Every structure is written in structure tokens, then in C-alpha cells.
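Limitations

Structures in this collection are predictions, not experimental determinations, and the ligand pose is part of the prediction. Treat each record accordingly. The example that follows, with 4-hydroxyquinoline-3,8-dicarboxylic acid as the small molecule, is included so readers can see exactly what is and is not provided: the inputs are given verbatim, and the output is the predicted complex.
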Amino acid sequence: NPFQFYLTRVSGVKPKYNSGALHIKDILSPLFGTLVSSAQFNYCFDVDWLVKQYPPEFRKKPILLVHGDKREAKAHLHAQAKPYENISLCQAKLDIAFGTHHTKMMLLLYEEGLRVVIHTSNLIHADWHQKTQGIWLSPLYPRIADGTHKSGESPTHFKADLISYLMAYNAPSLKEWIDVIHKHDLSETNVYLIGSTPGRFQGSQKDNWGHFRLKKLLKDHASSMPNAESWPVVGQFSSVGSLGADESKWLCSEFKESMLTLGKESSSVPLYLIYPSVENVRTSLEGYPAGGSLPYSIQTAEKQNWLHSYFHKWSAETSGRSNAMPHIKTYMRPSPDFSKIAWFLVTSANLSKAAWGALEKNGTQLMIRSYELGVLFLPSAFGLDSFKVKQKFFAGPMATFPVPYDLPPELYGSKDRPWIWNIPYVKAPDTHGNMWVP
Ligand SMILES: O=C(O)c1cnc2c(C(=O)O)cccc2c1O
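Predicted complex:
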């Protein structure tokens, strides 16, 4: 397949639903390359667990942990890593309030080249156990011969864009990785990088990040089709931020407007949002504890009940993952009969202004609070007009895109409620016999 989009392994599904899936031990295996050094960008780390996922022969190679923790949380992470002399830490600066470091990425330097992994899982056991998570695996990027002067750039500008993302940290440990990337040939890359970094961007920088970055890519590298107004937008996420008192504040005014862009020309486009119901969580493989990773608070939700009429259940029969709660986040543009898609994005970014950005200063400035990272699949980058949707995710022309959940999405029933993690659920027990009492 050309897309190299994978799901993580799920404990408890039949082997046919894990055949093409990846565990972190598979990604770090010597079959993928002979490791020299690695950088782990993430949010939450269990360092003891993380080191055990590297093959024994590679467990003393240098590891850089890139995180956003401050104060006591920072001290706790340093204490976790102190027993391992080969682990260094890089604290991503977070100068805007309520921002976090959500980017999930591995940089893997081998004897044989370089690989980039952009994914959705925290580096803790539970995120790789029974959740639906997404992985994009780069090709093995060869080193450019010393003395050869090549760009090593792809038609999607991935090399320059990844360097630009890392430069935004202003961090000495990442300048080392920038120099590594400069020395490798990334020309085979067929995805576009979509990142968020904290800041206030105007003018020439407005299109670099967040939902304006997506809009720019869709204007430049996708084509509008007739009846484009009939092609829905689908967003699928594991958390929701405060979006405002009604849909016109942000969701349907600037977010949806960026997502409905196609081509360079001058809305009743349906918007489907997929987010687990309480029943989805109760009957999941993990039971109610799965909701520990779906952190929608009652304080936020009670301020935006208008939002929940957009919500659709989690269903993933196509990949055997209906009971594996989603921590992947995806956004896409299906055709009116959901048989084709105009593009697909997998990312760390949840449905929030912090992650995607919000316009400020009379619409002249995009303010982003957090670090996020994802990759965009555009048909034009594969020589196509659209992607056909793969009917079964793990089944057998390889130019069909593996969408990991069912289409069309199913609207919440009248008795369904969105999972809200900080209220009790004591009416019916979960798959382990327990209630939820936060
Ligand atoms: O992967 C992430 O980016 C991420 C960020 N935050 C949380 C929280 C929280 O914000 O307290 C609670 C539970 C899960 C996550 C999580 O998975």
C-alpha cells in the first residue's frame, strides 16, 4: 500500500483484526532499522515501560524525551528518567496559558537512514492496549552522501515543513535533530505535514499552522468538484474544548470554513462529529476506565449543549474496533454517499481552539496555544482525483484508503449522551462489573 497508515494492535480482537496492525515493539524492532538514537515527542510518559519497548540490544542508545511538563510534573518526569543515563529531556516552551505539548512523534536515526513516525498514542501501556490509535510510518530515508548537494525535498515540502516545525521549539537538543534531517533524503514523502505550535501568527505566518495551514493546503492542492456543497465534513476526536455559546462563534464560522475549502475559487455542508457515547464507553473492552482518556468535563459540556446535536457514535466494524475506544483523531471529506473521500487527516489535534487556533485582532491574527502534529493525505499527491474508501480496513487496487471506522456515521439516539468524564454513571455496570464514580 502507498499510504502507510496503520492502527495499533488491540488486545482481545481476533487475529484477523491485528494482522496489519502495529505495536510499539514492532515499530522499534531491528527489522525496521539498526537504531543509533531516537527522539520521543509526547504528552504522557511511563519511562520504565517505554525503555522496555525498545529491543534489548537498543536500550542504551540515546533517547530524547520532548515534553511540555512544568513545575512538579517536570520534576516527576526527571525522576522517572534519572535511572537511565542515556535519556535526555527537552522541555517544550509553553508561553501561552492553557497550552500543552500534544504532538506524538518518533524520530528514529538508524545506521541505514532515518524514519519519522507520527502517531496518536501516549507512551504508556494503556494507550497501546485496547484503544483505537493511528500511526503514519515514513519510508526509510537514506542519508545524502557527504559532498553531494541535493535538497532531499519531496513534492509535498515535508522536509522543509518538518524542519520548520522543529525550529519553532527554539531548543538546542532539537537543533541536533534538525541537522540530522538536513543530512537525509526525504523526497519519497507523499503526505503533507500539518502542525500547530504556540503563538500569535499574522501576515506571512498566518498560513503556517493550525486550521489556516489546512485551508492553505486544500486551496493549493485539492480541486473543487461539482456539488461540493453536498460533500460532508467528518471530524472524529477524543476530547472537546470550549467552543462558545453557539456554532457561529468558532465551529461553523472559522473551523468548518477551513475544512470545507477546496481549490482556489471564491454553508449547508453537513458536519458529522464522531465522539463516544456513554454506552460506547460502558460496553468497551476497557469499560468505564476508557473514559479516563476522553476528558470532556461537565463544566465545559454544560456551556455548549448545542454541540451535542452534531455527535455520532463510535462504530468501527470495518476494523473490528467498535469496542476499542478511540484515541486517534481524524478529519476527512467524504462524498455524499461516503464511497470516496477528497482527503484524510490523522493528527493529535482534538476539537478545540487551543489545538487548531482561533482568530484574534479583527481576524488578522491566529492564536494557537498548543503543539500538535498530523499528516494529510491528498489524492493529488498520489496522482488521483479522489480516494476510494476501503470497504474492510484489513482486507485486500491498493489505491483505496483505509478509513478505520464505519461510514456513514450513526447519530446519537435520543437516550444517548456524550461521554463526560467527571460525573458518575451508576445505572448500569461496565464489561468488568464496575460503575464510574469520579
Ligand atoms: O493524548 C493527549 O494529548 C491527552 C491529553 N490530555 C489528557 C487528559 C487531560 O488533559 O487531563 C486526560 C486524559 C487523557 C489525555 C490525553 O490523552
